[PDB]
Amino acid sequence: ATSVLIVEDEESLADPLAFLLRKEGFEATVVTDGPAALAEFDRAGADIVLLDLMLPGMSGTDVCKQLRARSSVPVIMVTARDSEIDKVVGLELGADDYVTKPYSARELIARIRAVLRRGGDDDSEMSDGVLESGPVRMDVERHVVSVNGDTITLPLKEFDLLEYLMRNSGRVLTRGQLIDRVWGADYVGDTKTLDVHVKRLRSKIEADPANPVHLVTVRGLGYKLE
Amino acid sequence: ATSVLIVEDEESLADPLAFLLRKEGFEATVVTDGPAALAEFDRAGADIVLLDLMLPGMSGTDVCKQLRARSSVPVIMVTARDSEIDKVVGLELGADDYVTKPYSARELIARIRAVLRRGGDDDSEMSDGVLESGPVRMDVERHVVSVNGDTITLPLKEFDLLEYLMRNSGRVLTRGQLIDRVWGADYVGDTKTLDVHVKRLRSKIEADPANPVHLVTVRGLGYKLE
Ligand SMILES: [La+3]
Ligand SMILES: [La+3]
Ligand SMILES: [La+3]
Ligand SMILES: [La+3]
Ligand SMILES: [La+3]
Ligand SMILES: [La+3]
Ligand SMILES: [La+3]
Ligand SMILES: [La+3]
Ligand SMILES: [La+3]
Ligand SMILES: [La+3]
């Protein structure tokens, strides 16, 4: 039967695939690094190779070239998390990030603005340590928020919105400021989306999300966290 | 203001990003190949570089290394369509495909089975030319189907289902065969999903999708295209 060599350092991704392959009549062998991959290919061969692009020691890039050097027969499919391809282009090209295209222009602008303010660090924007305002605490470097207890998923946009409001506690931020920061650039329907997001935060942060007293609207101006 | 160098061979991706950047107070310069990128960086510099990974001539991989060699300051973000990263890993590593992880195991199995039958070619599975059955015509190599006129989106699963039924016109295919081929491996709820997909095809292929006469159910066995 067709032989699949799975080269993968996450046992919990590899084992279920290996299970399914086997129940479907394929042979599957799982190995966890480049040396073990090359030894097993030489021992037994493989018809299909599924290759983790980021491995400890010998890079997946080098494993791939070495397998291909041995035979033109095997199908070799390289696999990577967003975070692994980001690491690989850093090590291999000196790139700061990899992004799959078509991508939202505005979202890319929001990421550019973030880089320029050293986004994701407590020590950015002349601050230090965890942000606090009323019962809300935000650990920016760890990406966690509590409202006494740890507050559930904040989707990314809600987190960014709250961070920007907490960093400017007691001061009004305008719709334009808030939109540029969280969504990147102004766009059709942005004011409504901002308000939906403010209301979602309110339901997670406020004693009564109906008459809010912490995340308030400043009519004609924008929003403020007191 | 912050300068963004956009290195991109698709004017219709680059120009709208450049527009938005400019309206948000950034400088943006768009160039369309590696030589032009390196000349412009040397002329004017850039704070941010957005770099198409696949370019004509000098590869985006080589541009990236050459820009980084010049300065450690610029943020360099490499961008690629699914199809461009697939091409790059072929040229650079000898890999047949790149896949972003976590990925459906079953879907990966369906792609393995497809490779093994030389999927997507008219000449595969002892056939030749376009498939025809009743009013339905399928050009497998071009990925187009007509029912007299060109039949709308067939989502991929519907296309695969129909192809497999057309290749075996007049013969019953079982639920197990159909599931293994289109979805890759058996799974919880597969029989129902198969039927939903058969009904969706019926609404696109059949005179009356209520009493079907072309794509028929064979009770106890599976489905058949007459
Ligand atoms: La173990
Ligand atoms: La194990
Ligand atoms: La890994
Ligand atoms: La990334
Ligand atoms: La703006
Ligand atoms: La033009
Ligand atoms: La132009
Ligand atoms: La390109
Ligand atoms: La791919
Ligand atoms: La099966």
UniProtKB/Swiss-Prot annotation, chains A, B:
Residues 3-116 form the Response regulatory domain. Phosphorylation by SenX3 stimulates binding to the target promoters. Activation of the SenX3-RegX3 two-component system is inhibited by PhoY1 and PhoY2 when phosphate is readily available. Overexpression of the kinase domain of PknB (PknB-KDMtb) inhibits the transcriptional activity of RegX3 by phosphorylating Thr-100, Thr-191 and Thr-217. Phosphorylation at Thr-191 and Thr-217 abolishes the DNA-binding ability of RegX3 and phosphorylation at Thr-100 likely prevents RegX3 from being activated through conformational changes induced by SenX3-mediated phosphorylation. Phosphorylated by SenX3. Phosphorylated and inhibited by PknB. GO terms for molecular function: DNA binding; phosphorelay response regulator activity; transcription cis-regulatory region binding. Pfam families: Response_reg (PF00072), Trans_reg_C (PF00486). One of its GO terms (cellular component) is cytosol. Residues 128-226 bind DNA. Disruption phenotype: The senX3-regX3 deletion mutant shows a growth defect after infection of macrophages and is attenuated in both immunodeficient and immunocompetent mice. Deletion of the gene leads to differential regulation of a set of genes involved in, among others, cell wall and cell processes, intermediary metabolism, respiration, virulence and transcriptional regulation. Deletion mutant is attenuated in terms of its ability to withstand hypoxia. Changing T193E: Does not affect phosphorylation by PknB. Inactivates transcriptional activity. PROSITE patterns: OMPR_PHOB (PS51755), RESPONSE_REGULATORY (PS50110). The modification 4-aspartylphosphate is found at D52. Keywords: DNA-binding, Phosphoprotein, Stress response, Transcription, Transcription regulation, Two-component regulatory system, Virulence. InterPro entries: CheY-like_superfamily (IPR011006), OmpR/PhoB-type_DNA-bd (IPR001867), Sig_transdc_resp-reg_C-effctor (IPR016032), Sig_transdc_resp-reg_receiver (IPR001789), WalR-like (IPR039420), WH-like_DNA-bd_sf (IPR036388). It comes from the Bacteria. SMART domains: REC (SM00448), Trans_reg_C (SM00862). The keyword DNA-binding applies. The modification Phosphothreonine is found at T100, T191, T217. One of its GO terms (biological process) is phosphorelay signal transduction system. Homodimer in active state. In solution, exists as both a monomer and a dimer in a concentration-dependent equilibrium. This is Sensory transduction protein RegX3. It comes from Mycobacterium tuberculosis (strain ATCC 25618 / H37Rv). The gene is regX3.
